[PDB]
Amino acid sequence: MSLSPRVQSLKPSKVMVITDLAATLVSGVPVIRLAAGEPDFDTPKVVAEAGINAIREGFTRYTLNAGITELREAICRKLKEENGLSYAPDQILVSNGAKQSLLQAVLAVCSPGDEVIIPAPYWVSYTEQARLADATPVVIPTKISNNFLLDPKDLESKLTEKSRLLILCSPSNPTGSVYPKSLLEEIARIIAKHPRLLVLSDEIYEHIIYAPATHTSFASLPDMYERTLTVNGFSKAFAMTGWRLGYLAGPKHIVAACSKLQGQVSSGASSIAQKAGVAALGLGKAGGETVAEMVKAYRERRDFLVKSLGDIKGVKISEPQGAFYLFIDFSAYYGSEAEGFGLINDSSSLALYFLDKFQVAMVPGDAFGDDSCIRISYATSLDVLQAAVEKIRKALEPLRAT
């Protein structure tokens, strides 16, 4: 009955657990679902059509494991036009989603004992992927008064000789924060003084961004091109959740080793999805009006929640600059009791209270390494969001702040 130590010490993704729990409950139990971050739009018409055309034209046989040339060349043009980055097509590795991209990158560059520096709140997979490579997660807490942005001084103090990989998610999952160029530059100068330290730049939410914030690719900073693994994809910006199409861009020697690894553990992205990705990149800079319409809806949802929830006593919010998540501080309510439920002690019991007693499904902050908050996804309709706020207010009424 035994299992490997790597897998048995692995922690289930609470994002997926709660999501599937809410789905299954939706039996015949109506639950407001704000856990997993999945765009509530159809794949854009021309993208879907390219996928259909791929099938109809029999584009279902062997394709290059690393990705078809047509897609990798289109990805190089995107990186240059949108991010100012110069890559050759063999510096691109196309995978089945960004989760696989990140894993292969970590396995490729992290030796046993190496330290992976992960700012909190973090996306749930960063720590677990680190452990899978026999690497040691080095978590750096951030503060809500600082938009959950990394403080350079904290970075420096935690650097050792074993420091190998720094993970930079911008715009962030779960906080929605966007690293300004100013801060990236300071981090860069720190990185530059540590020959062994590489940077993983997770830019999947790049186009989900709200003015005046701007996205700055870390590979674009002075001396950082040689240090940076750029991870990006299609699912969030183009509503291609079921397609699964991610990619990695980076230094030749690293990308070549990830491609070798992928060749032994994966078949690569589907040929059908890759054709769809080509058409998605064909929509123009930043996905054009297609993606702009979607961003405009996200922005309207953001503003509704931020004003609605921020008014509430003992609720603290950082107005997000991108993505589609709110990382809300309800910690003031910890220590109080809700009749019929019990004590609200932390983010997990609070979320469980929201779910059991008010049928709203959110994800507790402890899954992202910050127990002071709970994450809401607002890739859902405005009416759902209105109903969710009404329930959150009612839920917090019998509780006590601080």
Added chain:
Amino acid sequence: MSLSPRVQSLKPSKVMVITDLAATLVSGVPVIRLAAGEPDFDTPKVVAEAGINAIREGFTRYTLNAGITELREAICRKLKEENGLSYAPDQILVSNGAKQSLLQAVLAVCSPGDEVIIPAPYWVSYTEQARLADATPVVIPTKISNNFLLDPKDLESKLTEKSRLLILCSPSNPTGSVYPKSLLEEIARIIAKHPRLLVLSDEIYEHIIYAPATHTSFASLPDMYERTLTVNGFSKAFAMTGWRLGYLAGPKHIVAACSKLQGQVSSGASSIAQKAGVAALGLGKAGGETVAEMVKAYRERRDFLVKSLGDIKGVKISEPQGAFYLFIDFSAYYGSEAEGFGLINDSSSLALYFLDKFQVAMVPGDAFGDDSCIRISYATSLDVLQAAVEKIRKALEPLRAT
């Protein structure tokens, strides 16, 4: 410039290397391509249509990571109807292809130092996937006079306390051999006396089988259900190479741990591919007439090559019982010299000679752990095969046997 020890010691899949080499050469250089094993048929009409319908009906948003219920239930019915196996839907884990299925299975059950028993000739990824889990490959050579089938006595001798996983590929890649029930039973009784030993049963080529041979699922043998991880898929039988749809069936506790792992490192199979898989399973027992037509073509190609190549001096062949590979013994020609090329010393130089001087691309046996042979894929037309044989004859003419 450094990389992890796991990845730098990883060996590139020569199957993919030669395949991409031949493709790229096909510039404007005509090469007979018989390396990678990819069906030369369109995805069946109703399967392709289900994929198109999935896209058109907007089935592109969140799906359960482990696989949609509809597909996992259909997979359970297949396993019962075709293989005599009883699984619950939560004993099925749907992945992006069988390569990922196998990796997660290995990472889940193999602790560092555990030994993975791999009969040779083997599929190229088994040893490398073992190393990725910090496990130790234990290769057992087989003999061509014995249809490259495992000898129980050799299995017993190599068993230690560190023995954790035995990998059984039937019908085999690369040899095309099919394990009879008789032999599986003897192996089973050996397995049964070693509490820690599990079995990975790779049955992806199950329906590509030529009478009188029959496929016997290892999980069906006495006391083996609790010991067996069954890996299967869609790409080979249903010509779904670009779809990427594999699955694992096994004991609940193991499958649950693989599902947890998959949740942190992958997004799972595309939603579009999963709908296509449902329709594929809907074709009936063994894929019905659809798959039967394809098997009939493979069988005709097998018979042509086996008679054509077997006549040639110093060429030894085992008539395959399934899959679509020939593992041909040219070793008699080793030690001879070909003017304009040089010495033919082993399977790699021989293959290189075929490729450079006669534009036929095959894969040397050393990639499968047996340097005495070279592998040919006959998932190509009869005319290509006829041309390949004509070139192989001409190539061997100036060489010397034994």
